């Protein structure tokens, strides 16, 4: 006897890391309301969720 068989297949996956699952990009903009200019502005900012 002779047997002939042929086919195909498809696959798709998705892997996620639960420690770093996204990256946040924030657009900020400084301003001055005082009296003198400040050169080399180096501010520190927080990011609170709840």
């Amino acid at each position: 006897a002779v047997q002939d068989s042929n086919g195909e297949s498809w696959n798709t996956g998705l892997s996620i890391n639960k420690g770093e699952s996204a990256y946040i990009n924030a657009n900020v903009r400084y301003y001055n309301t005082g009296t003198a200019p400040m050169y080399k502005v180096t501010p520190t900012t927080n990011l609170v969720l709840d």
Partner: protein
């Protein structure tokens, strides 16, 4: 016989006259009290990110 009676960086004349920094308390202006800060750290909450 000393220029820093209390051991802090400012001398006797600087402390007595108040010629030192203006953000240090008045009680520090006598020579026998040291202007030595006490800084501590206090935790408020902890966040765990499972990997």
């Amino acid at each position: 016989l000393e220029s820093n009676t209390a051991g802090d960086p400012y001398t006797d004349y600087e402390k007595a006259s108040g010629s030192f920094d203006k953000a240090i308390k008045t009680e520090a202006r006598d020579p026998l009290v040291a202007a030595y800060p006490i800084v501590g750290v206090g935790m408020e909450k902890l966040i765990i990110s499972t990997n």
